[PDB]
Design a protein around this ligand. Sequence first.
Ligand SMILES: [Cl-]
Ligand SMILES: [Cl-]
Lengths: 291, 290
Amino acid sequence: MIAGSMVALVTPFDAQGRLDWDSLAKLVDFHLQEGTNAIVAVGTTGESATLDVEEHIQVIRRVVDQVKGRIPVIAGTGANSTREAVALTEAAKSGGADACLLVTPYYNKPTQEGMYQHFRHIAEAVAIPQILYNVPGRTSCDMLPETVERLSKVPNIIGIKEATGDLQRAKEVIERVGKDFLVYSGDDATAVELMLLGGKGNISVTANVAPRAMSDLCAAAMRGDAAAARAINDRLMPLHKALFIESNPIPVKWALHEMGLIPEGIRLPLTWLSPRCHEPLRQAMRQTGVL
Amino acid sequence: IAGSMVALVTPFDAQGRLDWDSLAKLVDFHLQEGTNAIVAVGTTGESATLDVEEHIQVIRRVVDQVKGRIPVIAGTGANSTREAVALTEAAKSGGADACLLVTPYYNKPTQEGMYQHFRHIAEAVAIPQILYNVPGRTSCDMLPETVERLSKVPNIIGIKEATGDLQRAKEVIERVGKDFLVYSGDDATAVELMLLGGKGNISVTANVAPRAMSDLCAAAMRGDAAAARAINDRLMPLHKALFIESNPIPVKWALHEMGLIPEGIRLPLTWLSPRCHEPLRQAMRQTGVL
Ligand SMILES: [Cl-]
Ligand SMILES: [Cl-]
């Protein structure tokens, strides 16, 4: 089921920037062992922007083939061209993905109607479940709740990753969509509150490094155990903050390399975490018991 | 590379196919009306929805028609350094005089990552390169300290500053060498950026008012503030209405109304909403374009 703690998985690169399949296999085994509910491969945390079409499908198949159906595998397949998004989404389907996550078009600032038409088009073009993703702090556009509600009535559009961290927005979306349309957090610091409001999962950067804790956090929030959920969240807060001290996924790749899970590669225009940021993150990782 | 530089639309037919005859009409319109350069396949040209093959073909077609009469600048930015290098290499082979490279959108690089991205591209491809800062689209802002660093890299010849912030414009102009040229990417304020020492405007409004834009840039660049401002003030209703919905949705409606292009635009962009037709039509009539 496409709910709970879903890791926004990094894509590990060796120091020359090439895909590191051995390291990817370690990460997939770690999630399998620690209670992660789903894996999101080749999204923003996975450096979607710097993977070419051939690499995008390679990663998806390698994750799908290793997971062997044990938990869902969701593929990032958004683009700011409708045509490209269709091609990425068809590739995910061919690759064996259970669902796709599609960011709102970045850069070109479509109207709300253009957002509707874009997602309506992709939903009809490719028969795979699709999850919308609203992150205005990256895309420079905001899919408003009225538009989310319209798309919630389309076949194959199963939910939304809402990344604004605006809990008034979360509540408005949750109120306006059917109970079958699931609202997931895209903001690790506030995800507990979004799930307590009725959301059904967290597509999480923190989960890369604290998957068991995040799995426990989502389960607690999702059953309404507010005290338990907030307790884990409050303990993780320094790590949620540190993991965005420079743009995600720079901090989390540093953290995963410190854990011995991945190599030091990251592709331009992203850079390895600045040394001025290493202390706050290392401290958070020790404090939460991750390292 | 200076003056009124049109941020040229890419015309499509009703089924979304490239309309080469319409493109040629537009290039002739600019040649006749005093436009000083053409920026092909940028933001106003729907770079996002052109595939690699289409991108280069548009550049090739514009270059070949222009025949050296005015500079042709190609939009070649990307949010992957690897992609940006390929676009830039392609434009150079295609005969572009320069390339315009947006700062990486969506993935929010650090300032150091911006430096390394642009310096890599400037080393990789021997074609003049113009930086492009537009935080309202990219969700990152290239700060003047980074602009200055890059202004020392060979091959990096200028910057299109689209923030509309004239204190930002002044800071950039003061920090960089007199050889590194600062161009406006905000039509409403471009006149002031040129009066501050900027050297052109990479303009949406020039698509529909090329003569007026050319006259405005020439006045601003020789320091005739009164004449530059009077032209700009005249055009202001059009500058505003051309962003009533995200550019290039309004300007494509305007160019179709003028009879210059067909009514095609590629998803996720949509044809101008009906409620926006009147204010734009009125602004075009007020300003003498229609
Ligand atoms: Cl971030
Ligand atoms: Cl706009």
